Amino acid sequence: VANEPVLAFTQGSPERDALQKALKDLKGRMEAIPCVVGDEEVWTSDVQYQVSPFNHGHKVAKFCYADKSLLNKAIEAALAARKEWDLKPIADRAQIFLKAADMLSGPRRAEILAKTMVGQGKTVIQAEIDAAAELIDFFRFNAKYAVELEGQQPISVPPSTNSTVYRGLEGFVAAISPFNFTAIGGNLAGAPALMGNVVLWKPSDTAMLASYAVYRILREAGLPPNIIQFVPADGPLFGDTVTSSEHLCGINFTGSVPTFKHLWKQVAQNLDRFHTFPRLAGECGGKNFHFVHRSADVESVVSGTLRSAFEYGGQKCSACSRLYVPHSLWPQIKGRLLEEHSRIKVGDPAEDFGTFFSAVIDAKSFARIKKWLEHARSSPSLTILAGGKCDDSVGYFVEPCIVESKDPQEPIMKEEIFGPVLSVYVYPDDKYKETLQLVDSTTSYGLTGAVFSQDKDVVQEATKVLRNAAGNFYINDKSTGSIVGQQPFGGARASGTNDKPGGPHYILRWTSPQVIKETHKPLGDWSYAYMQ
Amino acid sequence: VANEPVLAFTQGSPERDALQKALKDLKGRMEAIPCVVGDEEVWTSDVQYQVSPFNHGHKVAKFCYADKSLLNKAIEAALAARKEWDLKPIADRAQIFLKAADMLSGPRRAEILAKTMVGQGKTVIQAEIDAAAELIDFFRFNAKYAVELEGQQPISVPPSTNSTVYRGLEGFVAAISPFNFTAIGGNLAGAPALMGNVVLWKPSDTAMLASYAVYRILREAGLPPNIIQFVPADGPLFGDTVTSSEHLCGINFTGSVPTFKHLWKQVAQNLDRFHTFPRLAGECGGKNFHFVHRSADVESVVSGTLRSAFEYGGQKCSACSRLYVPHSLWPQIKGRLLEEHSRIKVGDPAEDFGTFFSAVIDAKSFARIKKWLEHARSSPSLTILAGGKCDDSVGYFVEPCIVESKDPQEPIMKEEIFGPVLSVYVYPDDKYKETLQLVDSTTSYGLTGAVFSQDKDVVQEATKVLRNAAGNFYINDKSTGSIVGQQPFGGARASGTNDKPGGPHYILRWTSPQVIKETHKPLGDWSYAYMQ
Ligand SMILES: O=P(O)(O)Oc1c2c(c(O)c3c1[C@H]1C[C@@H]3c3cc4c(cc31)[C@H]1C[C@@H]4c3ccccc31)[C@H]1C[C@@H]2c2cc3c(cc21)[C@H]1C[C@@H]3c2ccccc21
């Protein structure tokens, strides 16, 4: 298996024509997305709408929230399907995901990209690397890893034969996916299902349109009923309900630190009722760095930092939000960042393929980011160098913002904003070693980080100092854009449990192996020779 | 790597003479075992004694409980040693464990066996398969698996080089080991240390002599100071102290389900203070079955069941405590079980090598078993077929006991006794399929189980029905005695987290990987061609 090729979308290309046609097919249209339990389309009275972030007057989907009753019905029906699905050979379960991957690659590529663009506000290329490439790669690579895992078998010595059976977990898994990557929903529900689990999938409200498209592709690729239940819901009620079920065996979560910790506390509070110990997997965010040494390639620093900080509006757990620059290069880097900043286009990504990034996802995010832009004006240690405006009249539009902090410990250097807000700290060149320690100590997070240096001694030094500051560490590249099979993704500290989805070990969280020993000769006496 | 050969200890063998000399060397002697922080031997006033279970007048060791101050000092010192240990190449960490394995195999074998016999009440062969064979195997196999893991590396695609660094966990690990296997303490503390972690090891009070011998061998094999701190303590105080530390990164536990669930709840209660999400690993109890089909080899049922139920007094999480026999074979199996029962010798294992098993571990365990034996003689559905008496006047001596239940759901069929008490349910031959379901549905546990059948269709059928009733499932063999590398050990339901120590994946719980991407060419423009 190889990584899915990323298409260029050149003027006149078939993929660009297909994508423009799929975008035109969504304009002025709304889909009614039901909850799905088995093959039943279920509607509750608690109706919700998804809107286009860059045109929030456009309702792109109507959906509804599952309540406690419907969620418990979905649990019961999933559990009643699990034994059969777990006994289905892994090669057969894998084939469904490989067929879904082929559909996303070819005939459904334009649709899944367009729904991710219109529903989540992604540009062409951000939709392509997510909803096509990453999702396709998770499905094909996890399928490869799961079939290869069957070959990891114990030793046999006469008179016995040993084997390992890679059972799914007994119970159901709750998959809770974020707004910002179509692919992550596919993986959070898909990887456990591949390993013989049954799943209640609560997709993100602001990603409904594309998340349901992923669900329908999996069902059309042959996923049986009751293996993944499609159950949008209020976050607290979903959490309360799954953590109250005696049958919970896992939570596969991506999102905020506090929500993950809350779910962990709810499981522990109910620990005496579960039939087994639930497995919690959480990817929980970052306050990621780009650290520049005075020997750096300045144009690589500028391009890589502008992409890491501002693509998809900085709405990535991997996005650079703290830049460390030596005094000697600062005038040059500042000049270049301010030059390029003025050439960044923010607008409608469906209508204008010149757009670098579009609106942030929703009103709540827009209000949080606006509070940070107010903080950057109201704080004595902060100076806005570029941007600072926002406008919610049409979409949730925030200009890319570059903020200089005179204080390396300022809250803007520590708290995850999840918006297009880059904080810069200028350090004395002769204090680069002290500044590496500041990079390591300043925040609670451990997710991504980059060092830009042509000086290999500084790279070797920075690599050692920052060993636990970043689970995905980059040398002379940007902190975003991990590729399945190339950079397995995750980190520790407050960033989560670090199960490295995108690598071969992630699937091991979703199997509880059994070992069988068969003895081929009679056993003989209970006593031992030495006892006689 | 091969499994350590199990020696026979027959009259005239070198290992029988060497063991008798080592036993002689312990008779009427006591060791003063300190807490060890770094290389410092530390005493508190909270002195404790380990006694021989078969002769509870004989103190074999004096030790002491670490107080809160000493545990906190142990944590700080371990943390200060962690970075250099984590950076030591895995080949160099492994060589320490391989040297320890060589010492245990050769010059320290008789000592570690004799300390396990006198201190924990094991017979020769139970000491040999534990303190020698299984511990040596853990050390050699985990070393092999850790060096193999290093070779699991991601795909590099120009212009970038990718690598995985198998970092130890950032923080300290608490290892909490049980009385019943010397080897398990070695693995619980040793496997995390192999993977670049630092450890506070709280060994079991009633295994202190042999646990300290393991610790000293590791230090003499080259383990640096402050990698494993030897800190016997009160169980509750140890748990409180380590779960209150913001630096806790893991608990490696073997013991009771209530203690494991308490620790899990304490970690969740403190989750906001930890620098990262602690990893909890728990092996707990079983209520393990031997299921007999009417086609079974009766003599293999009899010998396998007597060994599984009664070796080491049934003090194994894997021990058979429920036997399911078809009516057509019951007169035969009952007669053979009662004849062999009468031939079982219980006595002093050091003085009489004819002993099948000796006293149970301590007064608390004796009292629990005596309470169950009272239940067995005072319950409407139960009858005692053999045994039923106990005597604590010299040692904690319990006769092997066979109980028949007419009720397959009786408490004695469900609850883990951890003593030499076998419960038998006789089922109608034509209800063998309903009885397979009862095996699966009766208890809360999922650890070990066996089917005895020469009918290969019934073996297939039982394998499917009992898929989640046992994590270690045996076909025509007894339910105890897993061998490292051959039967990776563990199970789910209430039996724990099922991380399969003894197999290749267990060490993955003790690493938090980092992935490095190094890009060798400049990054180019931040814009994309399709945007022009
Ligand atoms: O249930 P209680 O503890 O109020 O009373 C005693 C009983 C009995 C008994 O011998 C005692 C008690 C009191 C006095 C004696 C005893 C002995 C003990 C304890 C309480 C009691 C504490 C310390 C010791 C013990 C062992 C295991 C769990 C709890 C304890 C009989 C009669 C009764 C009893 C209950 C049971 C059983 C047997 C009995 C079985 C099935 C159930 C049980 C629980 C835990 C282990 C074993 C059993």
Numbering used by the authors:
A (entry chain B), B (entry chain A): 32 to 563
What does the paper say about this structure?
Co-crystallizing P5CDH with the monophosphate tweezer (MPT) instead of the diphosphate tweezer CLR01 resulted in a different crystal form that diffracted to 1.2 Å, with the physiological dimer (instead of a tetramer) in the asymmetric unit. Very clear electron density for a single MPT molecule was found next to Lys402 of monomer A, with the single phosphate group at the ε-amine of the side chain of Lys402 pointing into solvent and the hydroxyl group facing the α-helix. In addition, H-bonds between the phosphate group of the tweezer to the side chain of Lys52 of the neighbor protein molecule facilitate the formation of a noncovalent supramolecular bridge between the protein containing the hosted lysine side chain and the neighbor molecule. A superimposition of monomer A to monomer B shows the putative clash of the MPT molecule with Pro120 of the symmetry-related molecule and the lack of positive charge to stabilize the tweezer at this position. Since at least one MPT was bound at Lys402 of P5CDH, and since the solvent channels seem to be sufficiently large, this raises the question of why CLR01 did not bind at this position. A superimposition of CLR01 on the P5CDH-MPT crystal structure shows that the second phosphate group would clash with the protein surface, illustrating the more demanding sterical requirements for CLR01 binding. In contrast, the MPT in the P5CDH complex structure is actually found at a lysine side chain within an alpha-helix, where the smaller hydroxyl group that replaces one of the phosphates can readily be accommodated. The surface around P5CDH-Lys402 bound by the monophosphate tweezer is also strongly positively charged by the ε-amine of the clamped lysine and the neighboring arginines (Arg399 and the symmetry-related Lys5), and shows a surrounding “moat” that accommodates the ring system.
The aromatic ring system of these compounds is able to include lysine and arginine side chains, supported by one or two phosphate groups that are attached to the half-moon-shaped molecule. Furthermore, we solved crystal structures of two different tweezer variants in complex with the enzyme Δ1-Pyrroline-5-carboxyl-dehydrogenase (P5CDH) and found that the tweezers are bound to a lysine and methionine side chain, respectively. Therefore, P5CDH was chosen as a target for the systematic analysis of co-crystallization with two different tweezer molecules, the diphosphate tweezer CLR01, which was also used for the 14-3-3 structures, and a monophosphate tweezer, where one phosphate group is replaced by a sterically less-demanding hydroxyl group. In both crystals, only one tweezer molecule is seen in the asymmetric unit despite the presence of two and four monomers of P5CDH, respectively, revealing an asymmetric binding mode of the tweezer to P5CDH, depending on the non-equivalent environment of the tweezer binding sites in the monomers.
